[model samples]
Target chain A: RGSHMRSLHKELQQYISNLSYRVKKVSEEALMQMPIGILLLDEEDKIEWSNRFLAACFKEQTLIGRSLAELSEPLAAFVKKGKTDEEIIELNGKQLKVIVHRHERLLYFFDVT
Target chain B: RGSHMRSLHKELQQYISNLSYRVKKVSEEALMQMPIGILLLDEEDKIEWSNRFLAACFKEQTLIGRSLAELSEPLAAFVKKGKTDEEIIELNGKQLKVIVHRHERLLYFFDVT
Candidate 1:
C-alpha cells in the first residue's frame, strides 16, 4: 500500500511539471508570432527573452541579457513603474507604441501599433 | 507488362494528387497568418474564404458564397473597373484600409492599417 501511494505521488508531480512546461511553450510560441515586438525582463530589469518579431525590429543589437537602459532611456523609466504603462516613442524616425506591464517580479514590454 | 504499366500510372497519379493537396494546404496556412485581412473570391466574384482576423474585423456573419456587391456597393463598382482598387472604409467605429486585386477571374481583398 505504501509503495502504491509513493507511485501516485510521483505521477502527480510529473503531471504537474509537464503541465508547467506546456504552458511555457505555448506562451513562447504565441509571443514569437506576435506582429509587434515583445520583451520580458527579470525583477532586476534585466532581459530574459525577446520574441523573434522584437529582435527583428531592433535589427542591429542582441537584446538578450541587456538592461532596459541599454535599449532606450525612456523605456527604462517607463518599466520602473510597477503597473501597466503605455506611450508612443520614436525610434529610427518612426513612431512605435510601447506598453509595459509588471506581473509580480517580471516586466513585460509590448510594442504595439 | 500491362499490369506493371498500370501500376506505375496509378502511382504517378497518386503522387501528383498528393503534391497538389500539400501545396493548397501550405497556401491556405500562409494566407491565414497574414496580418492584413484577406478574402478570396471565385471567378464569378463569389466569396470563397475569409480568415479569422478579417471576420473579426468586420464582425461579419457569413462570408462564404456572398457577392462583393452585397458587402459594399462601392466594392461592386470597383470590381467592375477590372483593375486593383483601394479605398478607406469606416465600419464598426473603426477605419479600415481596403485593397482589391483581381487575378485571372478571382478577386482578393486585403485590409491593411
Candidate 2:
C-alpha cells in the first residue's frame, strides 16, 4: 500500500509538471500568433516581450529589454499613468487602439484603421 | 552589506510573485474577452474551462467537467483523432472552425458563419 501510494503521488507530480508545460506552450503560441499586437512591459516601463504583430507594427526585429519611452513617449506616459482603459494611438502612420492591463504591465494593440 | 544583500533578495522575491500574479490576471482576462472562443480540456477529454463565447455557441450555461463525448460526438472524434489542424464543425446551427492545441489539450473555436 505504501509503495502504491508513493507511486501515485509521483505520477500525479509528473502529470502536473507536464500539464503546466503544455499549458504554457499553448498560451505562448496563441499569443504569438494572434492577430492582435501584444506588449509585455516590466516594472520600469521597459519592453520585456512583444508579440510578432506588435514588432511588425514598428518593424522591429526584437523588442526585448527596450525602454518603452525610447519607442514611444506617449505610450510610455500612458503606462506610467497606469490607466486601465483604452486609447487610440498613431504609430508608423497606422491607427492603433491600445488597451492597458495595468496590473499586468501588458498592452494589447488593435489596428483600428 | 550582508543585510542590504538580504533585503535586496527579499524585495526581488516579492516583485517576482507580484509580477507573476499580474501576468496571470492579464492573460486570463485577454483569453476570456477575446473574440475567439477557448476551451481547456483535461487529459481525460473533459472540459476544464470554456470561454463565454464558446459557451454561447452551444447555449450552455457552463461546460465544466463535461466529457467531450457528452457534448458533441463528432467533435469528440476529431479531438480523439489527435490531429493538430483545423476543422469545420456545426454546432447549434453555427459553423465553427476549431483549432486543436493537441499538446495542451486545448481547443480554440472561431465562428465562421
Candidate 3:
C-alpha cells in the first residue's frame, strides 16, 4: 500500500511538472506567434519584453531594460500622455498601435494588432 | 552469403526510402521559406499553387482552380496588358505589383513588393 501511494505521488508530481513545462512552452510560442510588433513596459515606462516583430521594427536593438522614452521621441510623448489604453501613434514614417496596461509592478502587453 | 545479400538489399531499400523522405521534407521547407507571395499559374492562366502570402492577400480564397481573370478584375486587366514584366497597379485602395510571364501560357506571379 505504501509503495502504491509513493508511486501515485510520484506520478502526480510528474504530471504537475509536465503541465507547468507545457504551459511555459505554450506561453513562449504565443509570444513568438505575435504578428505585429509588441513591446512590454514596466511601471517606470521601461521596456521589459519586446517581441521579435518589435525587435525587427527597431532594427534588432536590445530594447529590454531601456526606458520607453529612450526608444523614440514620439513613443516618449505618447506614454507621457498619461493614458493607459490602446492608442495609435504614427512615427518615423510608420503607423503603430499599442496597448499599455499595468499589473502590480509589471506590465502586460496584449496585442499590437 | 545469401543472408548477407538479403541484409544488404534491405539496408539499401531503407536508405533509399529515408533519402526520398528527407528530400521531400527539405523541399517542403524550401517552399515554406518563400516570403513574398508566389502563385504558379498554368498554361490556361489557372492558379496551380499559391503561397501563404498570396492566399492571405486574397483572404484565403481557394485560388487553386481559379483563373487569373476570375481572381480580381485588376489582376485580369494587368495580365491582359501582355506585359511580360513587373508592373504596379492600384486597386481598391491597395497597391499591388504583379509580374506576368507567358511560358506555354503559364503566368507566374512574383513579389508584390
Candidate 4:
C-alpha cells in the first residue's frame, strides 16, 4: 500500500542530492561573476577552496591548502572564534569588511569604498 | 601504481555528494529567509515542491500533486516549450518576472517594478 509513497520519498532524496551537485556547479560558474570574495576553511583552519575574487588577492602565492593563520593573524583569529563575526581589514589598500560564519566555516569579504 | 589517484577521485565524488546534501539543506533554510519565490517541477510537470513565497500565493488551494497545466495554460505552455523563458506573472498584484530554466526544471520569480 505504501510502496508508492516510499518510492516517492526515495526519489525526493535523490532529487535533493542531484540538486546539490547542480547547485555547486552553478555556484562555481557564478562565483567569478560575483563581486565579493568567498573562502572556505576546513576544521583545521586550512584553506579548502576559494573563489576567483579571493584568488586575485593572492596572486603572489597559492591559497589552496594554506593555513589561514599564516595569511592574516587578525582575520584567522576572528574566524576561529567568531560566530557571525564582522571585521574590517585593509587589502590591496582597500578596507574590506569580512563577515565570518564560524559554524559554516565560510568567510565573505566585500570592499568598503 | 595509480591506485591512489583513483581513490582520490572517488573521495572527491563523495565529497561532492556530501556537499550536495549540505547545499540542498542550506538552500532550503535560506529559502525560508529569502523574499523571492522558488518552485521545483518533475518531468511529469507537477508541482513537486515549493518555497514559502510560492505557498503564500496559493492559499486558496492545496497545490500538492496538482498538474501545472491546471494553474495557467500560458505558463504551463511556456514552461513546457520555451528555453530560458522569461515572463511577467502577477499574483496578489505583485509583478514577478518568471525566469524559467528548462534543463534544470527550476523556475525562479523575482519582483520587478
lDDT of each: 0.47, 0.48, 0.44, 0.46
Q: What's the distance in Å from true for residue B41, model 3?
A: 33
Q: DockQ for candidate 2, please give it.
A: 0.03
Across residues A1-113, which tens digit of lDDT does each residue of candidate 1 receive?
11221333432232233212233333532432122565655555676555555656667567776677887887676666644333556675433444332232222554532
* Residue pairs with backbone overlap in model 3: none
Greater DockQ among 2 and 4 belongs to: 4
- Candidate 3 docking quality: incorrect, acceptable, medium or high: incorrect
lDDT winner between candidates 2 and 4: 2
lDDT of 4 by residue, A10-90 (tens): 433442342232333345433221234455444446654454455565454576656667767777767567543355577
Could you report the DockQ of all the candidates, in the order they appear?
0.02, 0.03, 0.02, 0.04
lDDT, model 4: 0.46
Give each candidate's interface RMSD in Å: 16.7, 12.8, 19.6, 11.7
Q: Which stretches of candidate 3 lie over 4 Å from their true place?
A: A1-34, A91-94, A101-113, B1-113
Which 10-residue window in model 1 chain B sums to the lowest lDDT? B15-24
Return the TM-scores of chain A for each candidate in numbered order: 0.54, 0.54, 0.50, 0.54
Residue B32 CA displacement from its true place in model 4, Å? 11
Residue B38's lDDT in candidate 1: 56
Over the stretch B39-72, how does candidate 3's per-residue lDDT look in tens digits? Answer: 5544345564555455555565566667777777
Ranking by lDDT: 2, 1, 4, 3
**How well does each candidate superpose onto the true structure, as a TM-score?**
0.33, 0.35, 0.31, 0.35
Q: Candidate 3 versus the native: TM-score? A: 0.31
